[PDB]
Design a protein around this nucleic acid. Structure first.
Ligand code: ZN
Lengths: 93, 191, 59, 159
RNA sequence: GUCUACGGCCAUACCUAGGCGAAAACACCAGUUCCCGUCCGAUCACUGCAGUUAAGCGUCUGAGGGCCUCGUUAGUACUAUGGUUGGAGACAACAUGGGAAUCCGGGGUGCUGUAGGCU
RNA sequence: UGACAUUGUCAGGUGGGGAGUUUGGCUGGGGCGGCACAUCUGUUAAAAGAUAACGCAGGUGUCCUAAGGGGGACUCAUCGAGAACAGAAAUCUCGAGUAGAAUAAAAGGGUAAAAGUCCCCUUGAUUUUGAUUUUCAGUGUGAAUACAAACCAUGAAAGUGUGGCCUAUCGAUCCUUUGUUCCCUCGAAAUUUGAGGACAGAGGUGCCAGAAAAGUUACCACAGGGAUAACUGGCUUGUGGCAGCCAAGCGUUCAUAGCGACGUUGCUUUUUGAUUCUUCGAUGUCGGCUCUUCCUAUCAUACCGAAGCAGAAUUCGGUAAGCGU
RNA sequence: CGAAACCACAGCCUGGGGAACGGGCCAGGCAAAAUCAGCGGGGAAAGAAGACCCUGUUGAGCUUGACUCUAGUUUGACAUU
RNA sequence: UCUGCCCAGUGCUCUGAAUGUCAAAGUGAAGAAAUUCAACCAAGCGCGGGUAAACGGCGGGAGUAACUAUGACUCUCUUAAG
RNA sequence: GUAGAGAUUCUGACGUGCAAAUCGAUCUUCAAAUUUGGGUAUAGGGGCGAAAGACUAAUCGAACCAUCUAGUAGCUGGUUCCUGCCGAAGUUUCCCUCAGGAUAGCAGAAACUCAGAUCAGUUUUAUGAGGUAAAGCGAAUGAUUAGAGGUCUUGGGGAAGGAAUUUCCUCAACCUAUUCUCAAACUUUAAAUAUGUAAGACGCCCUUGUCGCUUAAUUGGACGUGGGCCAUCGAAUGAGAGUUUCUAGUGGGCCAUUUUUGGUAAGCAGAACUGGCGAUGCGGGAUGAACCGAACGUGAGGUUAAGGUGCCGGAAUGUACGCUCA
RNA sequence: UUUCAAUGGCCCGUCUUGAAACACGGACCAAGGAGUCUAGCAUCUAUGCGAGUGUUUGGGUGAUGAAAACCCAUCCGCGAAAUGAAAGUGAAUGCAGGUGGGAACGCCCUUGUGGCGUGCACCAUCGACCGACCCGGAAUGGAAGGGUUUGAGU
């Protein structure tokens, strides 16, 4: 679906608690930091003999996922997240 | 005991009915001719098939033609097979007619002299139908609803204008001009 | 074979203890009412209580 | 072969009447509803918003809450061996007053009026209804109405 | 009583054809400078009262089409309950109760609330 | 030979030679097929509600920055009569036109100064809290309803808007990631990295209340099951065979000498099939040999009838299962 | 001189019903001590917790590009140096 | 007496010529450091050559006949080789 | 071909045997890849194998012995004295769930609150809602057979003087008014049965107070306050009622009447209502889990239900009118 | 008690919708033979004490004779405070509040299913206070004002 690059909507930021102009970008997962506690526990568990210790995803399906839009305030730098429905192609502008 | 299963868009594979023609005789008849009517009516609820209707139609048509001629009968088959009785293919298979008690199966109109001929014809036609059937001498003038005495009184007044096999009957409804022009002999009583 | 749903005995079981009716209470919780109505009724009821208390104290 | 949609099996339930489609009469919006009023629920197919479930169609209840364009009809529904309180928010297009309550109010007013009148007159009032009494004794006459003897009719062909 | 404005029920109000409408109102109608909108002052706008009841509108008349109501159809179809009723069965009868539709025929062809104008 | 190799540690590749373990469910046995595993419309559904089958007709995991929201204007599909050109009612007018059009995708319902078409402006497809309805155990999820506190859109305004006119279009724990704040902690006291928390979301779990998972056993094993098949009885006859009714007929010529269509009423079934009521702590399972008995639906033998020179041959026809085959 | 298998109790048939082929139940045919030698129609005779099939979140032998590993093997780095 | 054709596939073998890629370890930069970012590296591997008295093939398939299925028929691709 | 070494057939004998592999006849080999004694070596995921998953002490598709170990089992069997009072379920939702659990329901026990306000598998009155039976097709939609008229406008053929943007009648088509027959996924209508609500004291009428809600406004909504009506407390009938806590079993059902769906049918499979068996003895249908009657402490007397009165068998070889020869 | 006659009476247990079954176990008899103990939890009941409660981890009379009975101190367990992840904060406007029903009691009317006054327990409900969250919010602190909320609280 087509979503405009810019929209005017309510800003939940404290400095601007009103409808302001927001720039729209699609949310993407982070770079998967290695220093996370779960990652460290998983590495410690996997070390040594015993083989695989936790389930590993084999089946893959449902390529369509919920679309998350990042709304950024112009002056207050406040960032807000919105959730859309599942679509195959996402186009900005 | 099955629910009615007519030919619809949901099941369009209903086979064609075996019986095609329904009326035999002087289809372009008149009011004066064919003043007597004979009815063959089932006495119970059956599922007479179109194949049985075909056989009865052939037997009745041949017998009436050979024994009374073309101009002594106007037999017609009132039953119209619409219900479908499924049969497993070696799914619709054929068409049957659902008839209740008192539902006319065969109706013929002849003259007074051909009463015995019509009775004999519809008696011999009972063997081609499943179940029990009865023959009744109708009291109405032909296929019209009016009885004999009512029809002759209407004809004597002049309220009936023949139109092909059927006829137009005067009624006290509608504009006067459209009825007065059509009916010259209609005696409108001023009361 | 599975999927053996039936409702032969369910009505008899329900009527064995009957169809119980909910207990009737004079006052119902105002959480089901309008927010503005409930907020105003709080002040209205409060002022009524003070008025009754003042009248009884003076009497 | 069974679906649990909200408006399943409502083909004729939510249909408008014959020659009754189109504009909705505006007296429904002018009717006033109060908490404690007894009202009937009749779903209107033209108003999709505020639609109650098909179970509550044709039911009767008491309003506990009143909003800008809806009421709080309260219903009791059987779920087995008990009744549960159901609080449905229904737009006033699907709500009408119960004529029984208006009849009951008129009956109460008539009963009180008779009670005051009988108190003034110093006689009985008889405010309690009674079932249909057995027929009393009458003296049916035959003058100019002589009885006619009837006999069963013989069977005959009527075709 | 008639008319206008706002309505309630939403065809005993709709559709069609033909006779009438004094006063007022309404309408038709005369123009494009201004507010306004179109290819086009046709419609929507504004400014008006020279002209006309001819159209709208109201009313009356159709053994009019529909619509409403009441009877016939008919306690008929159907149906709750019952029998160690009949019938091989399909079905039917009976007993204690409830009770249509449709057709046809008769009658009718809007009522009404508020505010104001009218020889 | 030679500071190479070997050896020791770690790491990458390979490694059924070997080890451990898995190889879903529903199912008219199981397997295969299919998803009836999470869903919506009409019907089965027998006029409250509820109601099943691997019953029927169909849809669904999408799509839309508009196809959401507001306001204004117009009225559709078809029909008739006219305008050209040549069928092209492409297109342009005047009348009729209760919606017979359209409304994203199946169906049902709804909608005519609109919910349909066109135009203008917008992002209520926004933040937060509680209440309620459906599926329900009145748990979760999903969907939905009416309000309240803010900020807004539109309109002159009343008002209307918390996505799609309504009924389908979806996701827990742990972990990761994102947003959030002058937020809390790293426990001897500080600063900075880093890490951990509270609140709000997304990542995938379609076996859709959510395991990480290939086969074979014609060498096989155990606990059971007649809840479950082969087999065994019993029941049914879709099929086939057979017996009556009607008579258009064939039978140089006579509708039933005798055949005898189309239908119709029945009987049997040694054809498998249908179901799973008996049997899985056990009814030895085809054929052949041997032997006895029973039925007639009669091949022959006995006595009869039907037609024609006779004599054969036919109806084996009528009784008849005694006696042979 | 001298067992064993087996043994709920027992033992004549027909029909009916019945967990759909009874020795027992119901209605009938009937029915007389104690015994010997054969016999293979019945006791759905005995053996053996069906070995065919299905279920079990019960196994095992075997196979493989099933999942997780592993002896071995190969290569590299570090030390011996 | 012969042992025919096929190296397309899976095996086996020879290449180090890709450095296309990479672990451990080592190198350079930044940071206050953990650490991060860059290049570096053998083998494996991707290609290339050979091999069938190696496994094997010598025709694959698609829409389809009166239950269904079908393969009658409707037709294509042969592909490494027919 | 004898000894020795084997075991083809009789599928002989035996087959609770002489024997947990033997006996008889017959048959294979019999100077080498021959047979065999003793010693020695190979040990269990191992050995050995001229290869049968064969042998490895009667044990082999992984020997025997002891321990872990009383291994686990959603599966099978069993589970020990009496009498009283009660007394079910095979159904909802979820679970790699379908021979199993959790959850709700059905039950017991312990109670507690109270007893005149209120209840009820019921009727009546008043007031809602439905779209099944029925009915209709000349009313919308679909299906359906055939006639009469209009249709001088091609929706088909030649001809009238080859000849016709002049016409015919079979060709199709449209419309009009009767006329044959249907609809679970058609309908203007529309039952019976079933179903929601109410049947005044927490009630009816005036005075007055509160509010930050609402209204132009003490305007209204809600909660209240103080007084009059308390003698049919406003249909009939009946009946004491309600709320907690804990826990068991059940979570395979089946039969009959009626309404049905899938099936050729079925002692078939699947739904709805009611009554039953399961857990129900007793009288009757000769017999029978469901059918009829009727629900059971131990007895006496009487009378019945369904069913019977020729004998078996208790009761009229009763009464009246007819039919029937098989 | 035995036997006879009349009538009735199928073999028990088990799984099962259904057993007399041609479904399984049972030839007979004697003895043995299967919901126990422990660490917890939940409801109910009894006993003692009660804002407290629990002497037996331990010490003494104690040597005579003392596995018992009896006595004794300091810790501690549970409860007396909750809330939040945490840093932290931490429960009276009032008669420890108002409303309705409500046991018992007292006062009258006269027999009533009668009125008046308080009102234990329990339930429903309107508030108040404490913690958390969301606010405005007049270096550090969040005092007053709040809230559609939230807690297994007062
Ligand atoms: Zn901002």
């Amino acid at each position: 679906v087509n979503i405009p690059k810019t929209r005017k909507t309510y800003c939940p930021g404290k400095n601007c608690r009103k409808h302001t102009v927001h720039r729209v970008t699609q949310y993407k997962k982070g770079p998967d930091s290695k220093l996370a506690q779960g990652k460290r526990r998983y590495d410690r568990k996997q070390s040594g003999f015993g083989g695989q210790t936790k389930p590993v995803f084999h089946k893959k399906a449902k390529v369509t996922k919920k679309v998350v839009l990042r709304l950024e305030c112009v002056s207050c730098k406040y960032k807000n997240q919105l959730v859309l429905k599942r679509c195959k192609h996402f186009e900005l502008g | 005991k099955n629910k009615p299963y007519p030919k619809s868009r949901y099941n369009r594979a209903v086979p064609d009915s075996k019986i095609r023609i329904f009326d035999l005789g002087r289809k372009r008849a008149g009011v004066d001719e064919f003043p007597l009517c004979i009815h063959l009516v089932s006495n119970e609820y059956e599922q007479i098939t179109s194949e049985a209707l075909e056989a009865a139609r052939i037997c009745a048509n041949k017998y009436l033609v050979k024994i009374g001629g073309k101009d002594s009968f106007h037999l017609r088959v009132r039953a119209h097979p619409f219900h479908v009785v499924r049969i497993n293919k070696m799914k619709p298979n054929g068409l049957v007619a659902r008839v209740n008690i008192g539902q006319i199966l065969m109706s013929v109109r002849t003259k007074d002299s051909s009463r015995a001929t019509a009775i004999e014809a519809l008696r011999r036609c009972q063997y081609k139908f499943p179940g029990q059937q009865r023959i009744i001498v109708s009291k109405k003038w032909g296929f019209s609803q009016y009885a004999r005495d009512e029809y002759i009184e209407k004809r004597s007044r002049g309220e009936i204008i023949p139109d092909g096999c059927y006829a137009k009957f005067l009624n006290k409804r509608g504009s006067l001009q459209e009825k007065l022009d059509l009916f010259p002999e209609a005696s409108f009583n001023l009361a | 074979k599975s999927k053996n749903h039936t409702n032969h005995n369910q009505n008899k079981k329900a009527h064995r203890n009957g169809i119980k009716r909910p207990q009737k209470h004079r006052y119902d919780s105002l959480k089901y009412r309008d927010a503005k109505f409930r907020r105003n009724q709080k002040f209205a009821n409060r002022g009524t209580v003070e008025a009754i208390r003042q009248a009884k104290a003076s009497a | 072969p069974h679906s649990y949609g909200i408006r399943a099996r409502t083909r004729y339930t939510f249909q408008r009447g014959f020659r009754e489609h189109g504009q909705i009469r505006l007296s429904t919006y002018l009717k006033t509803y109060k908490v404690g009023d007894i009202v009937d629920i009749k779903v209107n197919g033209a108003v999709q918003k505020g639609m109650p479930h098909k179970y509550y169609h044709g039911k009767t209840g008491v309003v506990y809450n009143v909003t800008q364009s809806s009421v709080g009809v309260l219903i009791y529904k059987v779920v087995g061996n008990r009744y549960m309180e159901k609080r449905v928010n229904v737009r006033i297009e699907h709500v009408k007053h119960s004529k029984c309550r208006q009849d009951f109010l008129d009956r109460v007013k008539a009963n009180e009026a008779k009670r005051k009148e009988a108190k003034a007159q110093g006689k009985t009032v008889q405010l309690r209804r009674q079932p249909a009494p057995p027929a009393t004794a009458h003296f049916v006459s035959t003058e100019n109405n002589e009885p006619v003897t009837l006999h069963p009719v013989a069977y005959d062909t009527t075709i």
